[PDB]
Task: inverse folding
């Protein structure tokens, strides 16, 4: 067995298939970051750091010796525990199709939110700079009126053009901004369609982020490194409940500072 | 023979083909529910209940015995009788093509209305909860002005997005609402086209329901179980008329509470 | 894995084989009901109800609609927990052949007693009518003197003959009555042999029932429906003991009211 200790969990095979399906579905729906960044293959469990290729000056060991430390970025392992009713698990073999997988959905939504907020806003404790912090283009303010959203977005499209950047540009919106441009309409279309006319990429719902992000998806600018992708593991169990977790280990690198514009309220 | 007792009816083969065609045509046109829900294969005449896979605590038979009843949902058989003129039946072999099949059309419309109102509004006596009652998303009020319909519908599309749900969304409208958004026009299109721009599913005419329903058609959320599909059976006859019926047996299950938004006036 | 969670139990393979053998042996010995009734194949875990083929009038959904609920009988799941010493389990691999399987035997005897008392005396909470309650033939009183038992039994054989019934008749006795007709002797034979001369079926020891039952085993009159047959499942464990259970899910149907005579004290 492995670190998931999956065979020790009192979960049947059919219940496991339903839990895997629910977690994978809810996660994909709430991920916006993997649609725009380069996603590496999983390095594996032993992978601990990503080389940046830079060098750090250290106090010379002896006379005439020049020493340099190799720089690297550590992976962070992110774990979201959740708790399942054993009655709901037992219902699945009897043929129930409405078993309560709400904790699985909440854990997948929380893991997806962490991953997206780590990619776009950073996680300083894990030495990850967000796309918002690593952007060299000027930051823009989103207006209160949703009918004035496409104007400011177009100004962001000016900045990537002034930065000398090609590629399909894509706009990612926070859930508040996505709702505002979805529910306001002008001439038989919502403002989301007006945003769709400005770019050759995609208007992407990004419920974890704040503000908005416009960026190129030409490739090679944004890199998500995975040691291991999302997995479900077993912690402990009692007569009534099974404690499990969702787990993934990653770091994020931004190679190109001028490939994005961040917007705030 | 079977329970339809079809060979006992004084109906010719050509008249039978015309009656089957008229009933099938009028039924499909008035069904909205089967276009969005999962429809099972017919179980057969012996099928009486659908297992839910849940358990019900019952008073222990003896000491040290733990007993549980298996929960299930009963099928309901729905029968709509109708009456045909025997002169109209006799006209068909002579080559008439305008035989009065209005009772067949009224029976098919009434059966379709029952089935759709059972799926969407429930039938408590048959222990069927409607989609409106089983929805966990908040209910919305449809405005008086049809030009304000697409706005509220978009708010419903917000709620399924806040519920974490994917899939093609589809909007079903009552006949009053469908007429209102069909006959009011803005900038060379009716409001029905404005609704069509908001979703990747279909604006569906649903004359049996009240209000409106927005829901995902990704699959596995809404399940119509059929023991036997719509069939035409023979009851009795006299010199002038033949009494027949339309008959179908079914139950409806909603597995996913957050996959729909109901709207009312 | 399944709902038994059998691989999670700290029970060795040899100990499992001994427990299965002990439970199966003790159960068969104490079952009288399966020797006389028709026993279906196991439906499976998803099976929840048995269709009776009857219809129940419900309040018409709308005008001109005739609705009927399909009638059915729910299965009941019967679980008898029991507790095993882990020292006795560990003794089996070392080669012990006297490991204490008394709790297994008591659980099998209790499960067999429940099943037989459910078949013959009913379980109202599970909507099961017993053979005694569903019999239309008159009930008889068993006399105090065992030498007068064969007389009354013969009167029961009159009643099935007056009911117009063929087939091998079989007599099932309670443990008190079986002991009384076993230990009293007349002319070199016990009274049990005198009972054996009256029928072409079998004198059957039925320790769970009260009184006596005489009935035909021609087939098609008494039907035991099994979703799942007797299985051993794992609940929980500590350093000293393993909690397991015996479990079976069933219902019982009596199709023929006049195929049996019940006797009481």
Result:
């Amino acid at each position: 067995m492995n670190n998931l200790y999956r065979d020790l969990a009192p979960v049947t095979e059919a219940a496991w298939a339903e839990i895997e399906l629910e977690a994978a579905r809810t996660f994909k729906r709430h991920i916006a970051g993997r649609r725009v960044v380069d996603v590496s293959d999983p390095g594996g469990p032993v992978t601990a750091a990503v080389s940046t290729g830079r060098l750090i000056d250290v106090k010379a060991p002896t006379n005439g010796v020049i020493a340099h430390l190799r720089a690297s970025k550590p992976l962070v392992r992110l774990r979201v525990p959740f708790t399942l009713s054993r009655n709901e698990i037992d219902d699945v073999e009897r043929g129930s199709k409405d078993s309560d997988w709400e904790p699985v959905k909440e854990a997948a939504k929380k893991l997806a939110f962490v991953e997206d907020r780590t990619i776009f806003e950073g996680y300083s404790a894990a030495s990850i700079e967000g796309i918002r912090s690593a952007s060299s283009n000027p930051a823009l303010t989103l207006p209160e009126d949703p009918r004035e959203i496409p104007d400011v977005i177009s100004q962001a499209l000016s900045e990537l053009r002034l930065a000398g950047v090609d590629g399909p540009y894509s706009v990612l919106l926070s859930a508040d901004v996505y709702t505002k441009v979805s529910e306001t309409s002008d001439h038989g279309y919502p403002i989301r369609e007006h945003l769709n006319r400005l770019v050759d990429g995609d208007i992407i719902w990004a419920p974890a982020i704040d503000g908005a992000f416009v960026l190129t998806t030409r490739g090679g600018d944004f890199d998500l490194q995975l040691g291991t992708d999302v997995a479900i593991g077993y912690a402990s169990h009692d007569t009534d409940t099974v404690r499990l977790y969702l787990q993934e280990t990653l770091t994020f690198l931004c190679y190109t500072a001028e490939a994005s514009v961040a917007l705030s309220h």
